[PDB]
From a paper:
The red/far-red light receptor [name] ([name]) plays essential roles in regulating various plant development processes.
In this study, we determined the cryo-EM structures of the photoactivated Arabidopsis [name]-Pfr‒[name] complex, the constitutively active mutant phyBY276H‒[name] complex, and the HKRD-truncated phyBNY276H‒[name] complex. We tested the interactions between [name]β and phyBNY276H, red light-irradiated phyBN, or the HKRD region. Pull-down and SEC results revealed that phyBNY276H and red light-irradiated phyBN interact with [name]β, but the HKRD region cannot interact with [name]β, confirming that phyBN is sufficient for [name]β binding. Only the PSMs of each phyBNY276H protomer and the N-terminal region of [name]β (PIF6N) are clearly modeled, but the PAS1 and PAS2 domains could not be modeled due to the absence of density maps. The PΦB molecules adopt a “Z” configuration in both structures.
Residue numbers in the entry:
A (entry chain A): 54 to 143, 157 to 379, 392 to 565, 576 to 621
B (entry chain C): 111 to 144, 156 to 380, 393 to 565, 577 to 621
C (entry chain B): 11 to 32, 42 to 61
Write the structure that this text describes.
Amino acid sequence: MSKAIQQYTVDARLHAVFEQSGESGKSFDYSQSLKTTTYGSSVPEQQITAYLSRIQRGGYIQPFGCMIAVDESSFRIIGYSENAREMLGILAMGTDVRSLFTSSSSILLERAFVAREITLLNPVWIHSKNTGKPFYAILHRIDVGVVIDLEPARTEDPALSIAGAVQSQKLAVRAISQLQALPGGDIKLLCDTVVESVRDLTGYDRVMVHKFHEDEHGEVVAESKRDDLEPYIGLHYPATDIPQASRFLFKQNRVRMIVDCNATPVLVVQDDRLTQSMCLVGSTLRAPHGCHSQYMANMGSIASLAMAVIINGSSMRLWGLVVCHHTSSRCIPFPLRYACEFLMQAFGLQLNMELQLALQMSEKRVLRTQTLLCDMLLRDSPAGIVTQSPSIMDLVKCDGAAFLYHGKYYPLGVAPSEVQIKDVVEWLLANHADSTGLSTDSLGDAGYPGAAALGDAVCGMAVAYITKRDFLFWFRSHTAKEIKWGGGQRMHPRSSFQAFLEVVKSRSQPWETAEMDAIHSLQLILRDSFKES
Amino acid sequence: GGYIQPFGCMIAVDESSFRIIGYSENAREMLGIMILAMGTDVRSLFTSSSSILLERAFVAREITLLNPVWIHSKNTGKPFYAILHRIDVGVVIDLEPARTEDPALSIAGAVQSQKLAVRAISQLQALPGGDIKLLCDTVVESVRDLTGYDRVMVHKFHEDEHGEVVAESKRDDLEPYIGLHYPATDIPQASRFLFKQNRVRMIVDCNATPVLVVQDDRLTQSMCLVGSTLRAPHGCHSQYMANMGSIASLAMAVIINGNSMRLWGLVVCHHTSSRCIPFPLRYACEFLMQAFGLQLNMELQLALQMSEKRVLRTQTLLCDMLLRDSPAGIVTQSPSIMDLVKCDGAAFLYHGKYYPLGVAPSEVQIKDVVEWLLANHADSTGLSTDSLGDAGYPGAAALGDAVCGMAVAYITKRDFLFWFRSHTAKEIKWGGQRMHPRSSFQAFLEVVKSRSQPWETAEMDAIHSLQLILRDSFKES
Amino acid sequence: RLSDQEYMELVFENGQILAKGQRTKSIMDLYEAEYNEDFMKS
Ligand SMILES: *[C@@H](C)[C@H]1/C(=C/c2[nH]c(/C=C3N=C(/C=C4\NC(=O)C(C=C)=C4C)C(C)=C\3CCC(=O)O)c(CCC(=O)O)c2C)NC(=O)[C@@H]1C
Ligand SMILES: *[C@@H](C)[C@H]1/C(=C/c2[nH]c(/C=C3N=C(/C=C4\NC(=O)C(C=C)=C4C)C(C)=C\3CCC(=O)O)c(CCC(=O)O)c2C)NC(=O)[C@@H]1C
């Protein structure tokens, strides 16, 4: 289950609340809706089904291109967008599509249609029969036929179209070469370079790198913007600001573009014999939902372009996103979007390399520290692991540490007092004298009566047992300590930041598996050493 | 006045005045003229839009960002792909006929050159990320599918700079070449230098008659056609290809980070008959090469780190074993000094007692080697060599093919640690004068006749670390 | 074997979020076949 699967119900409920607020004619309440709607509980299956159908079978497209859906065997039209006639300069249910374009273009379309498992005419460059207007035709297959997306192209000499494609691809190659030469072992430098390269390539006003955490919430880790804009670097926001369905879609359409959020969507008309509404999952012209369009309008961004960052985890994993914003309407041609996809693949490869190297370095460091601690223990008393230079404060990342041995209490850093720790010990023995140790992200959630007394200094605790009355403790304070962004009912980044600092109010950062394994290993070593005495 | 392959054309023009200064002898026939002559303005040979594009390319700083240009011939109206580069005298333009004349199909193919590369690289992304052989095999299959050649191979270069064939895909009726080693002189240093600056080499027909390039008689030296893509092959390599049976060839470079970049190897393609592939597929391959280089570098770094972890673990176990028992116990249990490094055998000399493991000399032979070492290498802490003959060991360096390389670490003055490697040919297997792969394989086994594989820096460091720990332990004793 | 991308759809079945779905020549041979310009001579 986890949050990835638990978040679907929450997303559906937020969607239903937004729809009801829209129907009743009232504004949407963000903070109240987030507080009321919390993970868990249940929901009828019909709500999930309706939510998914609404997201994937919306029935609307953006008004910067046309869409026509045709039957595979007959080439007869089974659906079209309401703006098709105006753009083609002219359709009906049953009309033959080959009659809408010139004869050579219809031959090329037939060739593209008859291919098997791969085709080298996708997209095709076609002309309209009545006017001779050039279009990029992009084809994909749905459970009832073939959908053609028609994107207008600039009228010019073909040599110039080829030149534009060439220039875009060469810029992408140069950017990848610049990535090659960075000195490794520094993810922050990698992101700082990629953001600038993408901004230079695409030309948007703001470019940001978003990273997703194990808790599914997002962080802005790099930024490149126009001078007169405010910075968003350092921001954290909840996990429900990007639903799970859009994340799933990002693993198939690696680039998403929204040209104008204020533009009026265009309805798609379809043959009345089709049982369901036409699927628009693979289409590039799909329109965004009202929630996100309103969020964009409030923020002040009119055009948007998002690209998935995918790493290897056999199975692939979504690490984050690259997000671009513009203060006015903006559209980019198809070759440039494929250049951006190429650069994102290079970035993903480098990122995966860096992550694995960092893991190895951490393992090495932990092993060395453990060996030094054991050597120190053998040449000294039991208290030789808290009084020397290396100490249990270096085994894992923590705010404080403590050693309780034969009634003696040795603290380091931010740790409870000798009176409070006694109470913690009584609570552990009364409730948790059935294990070798434990780890908790928040003492309040665990159920420690004195959690409020400790305050924000001590929120998370890892305890390792040595014997019936000797313990090792590691302590962490609350998350807000390490989070600094220099900046309630309206959907806006500030509302998101305030809503984030309401679920981590009495929580620390989670304990990773590597840190717990290191703690357990040192625990076994010390257990044997003290048992031998 | 060099030579170029007949499948294209070449014109060299002054940068400042656009006046032609040199050209290939086949230029007039290709351009449809048969005017072209010294001092003629190049723009007059092409349409107006072609001249505009050419001027734009000429006025750019990074001229490599406007390549390839699409132009049309003024007389006949056929399309050409032009590739421009700079030299000391002016600008060299390589003109190649385009096999597709319809503009719509031209644009479609230009877009496919990107889509195909993306779809190919998505298959490298999906690899687990811990195996170099699997990566090489996947790249071989992808390149073969894209280009369709008869044979596709991956060549890896060594520290000695000799080559090995590590992966290959071919027809069923051709003889395999996987496992072949050949000398380092089969690829001169100039070729390796050029494979970094210009990452592709193509030869359409080795038997084709070259075409002379004429130049202005006012120039003080011949033009530098080294960077041109139409340059003709050498006699040595042309004859080599003819003997081997290869008419067409395509070679691409593999680049990694060096210490400045390093040429790791090559991807080499062979066809039994003449072949010239269209531009979209060439660029689809050229884009995949960069992703291949990235992933290869990642794999090398990870393997290095895992090796370090392994050596440390083994050293720790050996030190524990030393603490538990006498030093002899180092060479009695399953972990032993043979697992510290890659070797054929090992030996421990301790107070005149001999402990051999695996393939090692005899006790009398070991005494002879110790005598030689003290006579000539007493003032040292140890050493390593890949051939006792080259080192000069007089006492029957001919210990056989079994013992050729030796690494020695001193302990105090009489206790020694030895690691032994046999001759290289032990680890080389291939199923298989006139320049031919068999001749190259036989010539390789004349420089490694009694030589072992070289001792690496990391293995030397591991041996030094173990030596230091043992020396401290014996200091305590 | 290179291929065209296939698109999937999320559905809710039996309490589960499931995803549902909807060459003997080389690439060079296809390129030669599909980019033939003979029809343009008519
Ligand atoms: C309303 C139902 C909830 C919600 C829905 C929602 N969100 C997206 C997609 C995105 N929202 C993003 C979030 C942010 N944008 C920012 O810049 C910041 C912070 C600075 C936030 C919080 C982003 C980014 C995306 C993805 C990019 C994209 O353009 O797709 C969607 C889907 C959009 C679509 O394309 O259909 C939906 C339905 N957002 C909310 O705020 C509430 C909780
Ligand atoms: C004759 C002087 C020596 C020599 C010279 C030479 N070699 C190259 C380039 C290549 N030769 C290659 C060698 C091999 N090709 C194979 O497939 C195998 C084994 C199966 C071998 C040994 C290869 C590969 C290259 C690089 C690729 C390329 O096509 O360039 C050159 C440069 C020629 C040019 O392109 O101008 C020269 C001068 N080759 C010999 O084998 C002998 C000893």
